[PDB]
Every structure is written in structure tokens, then in C-alpha cells.
Amino acid sequence: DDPVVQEIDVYLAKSLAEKLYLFQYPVRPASMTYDDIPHLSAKIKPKQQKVELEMAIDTLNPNYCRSKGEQIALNVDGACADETSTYSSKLMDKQTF
């Protein structure tokens, strides 16, 4: 079996040797791209490398049930303290990974 077609070459780039990461989401389909929804905040640590991500979520659209959101807010954050509330409003403003 002689080589037929597309006898292509290969090359090595060192430009990003320490700068490259691959990130994978087991719990979400490949077609459900994350690009559209505005990203808000993220955190990293160099050694024992781990990251945290903070993700905006729409509250006005119908599929957000506002009443249950308010109940969750009252259940998770102080009624009127709000000094370090997980959410600025009285509803779920965001969700984290």
C-alpha cells in the first residue's frame, strides 16, 4: 500500500508551552455552547491547580420562575443584612462551577 494522497507535514509550536489548558464539561452537551451567555467572574490558583467560575443567569425570561427564586434568596441569604449576600438582588443573579 503506497502512500496515496495528503502526505502532510507536522510542526511543533512552543509559544504556549506553559500557557495552554484544556477545559471539559461532562454535564453539558457539545451543541450547548457556553459562548452566548455573558461571563462575569473567575478565579485560579497556580499550584494544585484549580479554578472557580461565576456565570450570569437571566432572571426576567419566563423560564426563571421568579417566586421560587425569591424563596431561595430568602432561604440562602439574610432577609435584610445583604452585606456579603451571595446575590446583590433578592433573586438568583448568578451560578457557579
Partner 1 sequence: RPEVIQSHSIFEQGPAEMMKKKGNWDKTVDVSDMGPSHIINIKKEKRETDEETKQILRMLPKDVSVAELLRELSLTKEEELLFLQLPDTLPGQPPTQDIAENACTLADLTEGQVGKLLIRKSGRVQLLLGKVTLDVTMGTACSFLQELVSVGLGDSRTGEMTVLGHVKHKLVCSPDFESLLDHKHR
Partner 2 sequence: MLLFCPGCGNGLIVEEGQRCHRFSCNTCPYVHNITRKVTNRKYPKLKEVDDVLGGAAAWENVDSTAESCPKCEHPRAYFMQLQTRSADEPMTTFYKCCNAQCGHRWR
The verdict on 48 binding partner 1 (CB under 8 A) reads no
The verdict on 45 binding partner 1 (CB under 8 A) reads no
**CB of 4: closest distance to partner 2 in angstroms?**
45
What cell numbers appear for 69 in the block?
427564586
The verdict on 44 binding partner 1 (CB under 8 A) reads yes
Q: Give the CA angle between residues 85, 91, 92 to the nearest 5°.
A: 80
- 53/57 with CB nearer partner 2: 57
Whose CA is closest to 94, among 42, 44, 45, 50?
42
- Residue 79's identity, in one-letter code, is A
Within 7-26, the residues that bind partner 1 by CB under 8 A are: 7-14, 16-17, 19-26
- 65/74 with CB nearer partner 2: 65
Q: Which residues bind partner 2 (CB under 8 A)?
A: 27-28, 32, 57, 62-66, 68-69, 72, 92, 95
- Per-residue b/e over 23-41, b at no fewer than 16 CB within 10 Å? eeeeeeeeeeeeeeeeeee
